[PDB]
Amino acid sequence: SHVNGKVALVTGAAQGIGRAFAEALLLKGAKVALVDWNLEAGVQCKAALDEQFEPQKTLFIQCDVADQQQLRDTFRKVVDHFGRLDILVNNAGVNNEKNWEKTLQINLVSVISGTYLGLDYMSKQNGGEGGIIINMSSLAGLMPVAQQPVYCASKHGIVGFTRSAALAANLMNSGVRLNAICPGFVNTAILESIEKEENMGQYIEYKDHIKDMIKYYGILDPPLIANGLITLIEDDALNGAIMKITTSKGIHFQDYDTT
Numbered sequence: 001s002h003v004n005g006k007v008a009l010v011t012g013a014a015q016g017i018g019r020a021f022a023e024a025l026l027l028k029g030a031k032v033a034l035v036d037w038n039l040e041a042g043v044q045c046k047a048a049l050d051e052q053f054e055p056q057k058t059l060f061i062q063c064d065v066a067d068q069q070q071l072r073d074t075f076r077k078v079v080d081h082f083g084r085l086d087i088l089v090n091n092a093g094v095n096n097e098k099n100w101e102k103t104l105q106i107n108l109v110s111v112i113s114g115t116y117l118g119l120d121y122m123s124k125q126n127g128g129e130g131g132i133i134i135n136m137s138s139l140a141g142l143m144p145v146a147q148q149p150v151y152c153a154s155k156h157g158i159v160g161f162t163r164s165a166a167l168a169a170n171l172m173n174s175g176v177r178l179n180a181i182c183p184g185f186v187n188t189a190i191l192e193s194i195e196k197e198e199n200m201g202q203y204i205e206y207k208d209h210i211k212d213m214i215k216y217y218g219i220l221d222p223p224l225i226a227n228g229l230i231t232l233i234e235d236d237a238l239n240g241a242i243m244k245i246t247t248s249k250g251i252h253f254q255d256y257d258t259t
């Protein structure tokens with residue numbers, strides 16, 4: 001009943017972890033707006049979901065989340081079409097240390113923009129019913145990566161932002177909980193980007209160190225990450241939680257020594 005009948009918006013939903021989230025949420029009874037900048041992947045994804053689940057339970061919107069006008073229009077569309085917003089998953093992201101400025105815009109700036117749009121629609125102080133926002137970070141949000149310093153920067157920023165916005169929500173009595181998920185390696189297109197100079201820039205020569213870490217720890221499949229998302233949504237005690245998901249230690253929250 002925490003998911004059933006709710007409306008979710010998932011960015012980066014065309015493939016990888018985003019699609020896995022959409023499938024898990026549809027199975028739990030949600031309506032899902034799939035939001036992605038890749039029109040062709042998006043159409044393929046919705047067409048496949050339309051075979052499994054009911055067509056009216058999904059909407060596909062093409063949107064570059066880093067474009068604030070497109071993002072604002074996307075939100076408006078979702079709420080017009082489904083009549084409310086209950087669950088926001090800021091999941092879109094890239095790996096690109098060469099055009100690292102753009103990586104920050106997609107990975108960090110867009111998570112903040114999306115979060116604040118979600119709060120605009122969902123906060124009880126703005127006429128909403130409350131809700132949950134889940135931001136995708138990474139284990140790279142908690143630990144350093146020599147070959148991906150700007151990705152690391154962006155994923156650390158998501159952690160700081162989400163912990164902070166969760167405390168602000170309590171203060172503002174918005175009735176919105178904000179949590180983040182920090183997966184280890186997951187079997188998606190993004191893993192392939194480490195092979196590419198276009199993505200790695202000056203770090204390409206050291207790509208094998210990442211490969212050795214992959215070998216060391218192993219790779220999750222997207223559907224296992226989705227279980228984690230469902231836990232966050234179902235447990236309404238969870239606010240400001242940083243959920244780690246790895247093969248080595250499972251599903252565990254980050255502990256912090258706060259004052």
Ligand SMILES: NC(=O)c1ccc[n+]([C@@H]2O[C@H](COP(=O)([O-])OP(=O)(O)OC[C@H]3O[C@@H](n4cnc5c(N)ncnc54)[C@H](O)[C@@H]3O)[C@@H](O)[C@H]2O)c1
Nearest residue numbers: 012014016017036037064065092093138185186188189190
């Ligand atoms: N796969 C991993 O090992 C791993 C580990 C930890 C965190 N993550 C994070 O998980 C999230 C999902 O990535 P994934 O591994 O499923 O990769 P993926 O590349 O398969 O999926 C990312 C999706 O986001 C979309 N997207 C990218 N930039 C966009 C933008 N500007 N606007 C709209 N959509 C955009 C892409 O088109 C794609 O469909 C990302 O935030 C990524 O950083 C991945």
Ligand SMILES: CCCC[S@@H](O)c1sc2nc(-c3nccs3)cc(-c3cnc(C)n3C)c2c1N
Nearest residue numbers: 095138139143144145184185190191213217246
């Ligand atoms: C294209 C790269 C996308 C994957 S990143 O988000 C990512 S996920 C990940 N997971 C882990 C895990 N540690 C324990 C269990 S799984 C480690 C890394 C990583 C890679 N290189 C280092 C030093 N680290 C910490 C990384 C890392 N760089």
